């Protein structure tokens, strides 16, 4: 508890053993036969464990480029040139950099935006995800990939993630949108 709290602190925990996820949260309805990806702490983005990564082996075989996509995003841009430089063992070499290489400072980033205020709030006020998607892409080049919605819509600050909703999926003014963006 904090003076001018508690469950409102944003947490993510790595778990060494997936079945321990049941202890990580309350108001939860635990069941040891449920696999990690269906559990509330994973669905809320509060838990992580190495087991969800294992099909990176199979996807690495079926489409190499898709494994490079995820990397450019999750690493923030670690190209094989940086991996080569680090493999020389001299540490990460750096300094002031030329405008020719510094052009790469406009990578695309994964960002999160709120429908509570600003130009998109018109869609949060009872619009649909497909209206929001087409509008944001057209006006801003912002490409929407999902939502982060409160679980208790009627209490807690928990939110769940909805990858790629239908075109006619209803929005709430409290939703946050996962987006790809350049600024």
């Amino acid at each position: 508890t904090f003076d001018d709290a508690g469950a409102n602190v944003p947490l993510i925990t790595e778990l060494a053993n997936d079945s321990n996820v049941q202890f990580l949260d309350q108001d939860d309805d635990d069941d040891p036969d449920t696999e990690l990806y269906m559990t509330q702490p994973f669905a809320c983005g509060t838990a992580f464990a190495v087991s969800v990564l294992d099909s990176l082996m199979s996807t690495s075989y079926f489409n190499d480029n898709a494994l490079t996509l995820i990397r450019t995003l999750i690493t923030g841009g670690a190209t094989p040139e940086l991996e080569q430089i680090l493999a020389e063992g001299a540490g990460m070499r750096g300094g002031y950099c030329s405008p020719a290489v510094l052009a790469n400072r406009d990578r695309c980033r994964v960002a999160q935006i709120s429908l509570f205020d600003g130009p998109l709030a018109q869609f949060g006020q009872g619009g649909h995800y497909g209206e929001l998607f087409v509008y944001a892409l057209r006006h801003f080049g912002i490409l929407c990939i999902g939502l982060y919605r409160f679980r208790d819509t009627n209490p807690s600050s928990k939110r769940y993630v909805i990858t790629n909703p239908p075109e006619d999926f209803p929005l709430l003014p409290t939703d946050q949108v996962y987006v790809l963006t350049y600024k």
């Binding site: 049941q22 635990d30 069941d31 040891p32």
Partner: protein, 213 residues
Amino acid sequence: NVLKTSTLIRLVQLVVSFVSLWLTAAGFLHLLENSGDPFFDFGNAQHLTYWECLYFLMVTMSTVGFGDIFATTVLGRTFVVIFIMIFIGLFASFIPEIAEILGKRQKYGGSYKKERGKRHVVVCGYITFDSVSNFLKDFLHKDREDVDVEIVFLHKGLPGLELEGLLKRHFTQVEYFWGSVMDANDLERVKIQEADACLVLANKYCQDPDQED
């Protein structure tokens, strides 16, 4: 995809391989004794039923060997010599392995049947003849007020023979279940939402009290 568990796979492979080998061997001996020896112009023959062969092969598998029935054709006797060398090893390894598999099933399974007006207490952690006997001797002591609380032990172990005795001597008011408070299904089996309290005991004599805590 109906054999989902390695012990149950092993059980069905053992039983079916044993039964099919016994049944086929009985059929081969039945052919040999009833047909008779070919080099004696089939004159040397012995009319066993299939069921007499099946019985006789079990009686020789197990090395009992009554000799109420026996093979008398030369092909019968040579088959019985070959059968003895093979099937003694089969029977003498099958019977122990089936006794292990059928011995593996948990004794103290099931769930607490909550009575209409009795309070209960769930007890777990360090459960042993010593910790339980010192616990029950005080918790049920005659100098306490007369209250009909039931005790429900929840622990991973099978109770030892001294503890099984103690559980039977208190049968009316002490109950024991195999399980762990680490599993929500075991917490439901003991109906812990309807208990007064959970008591968690400690191994005071462990190698590492930080590990035990």
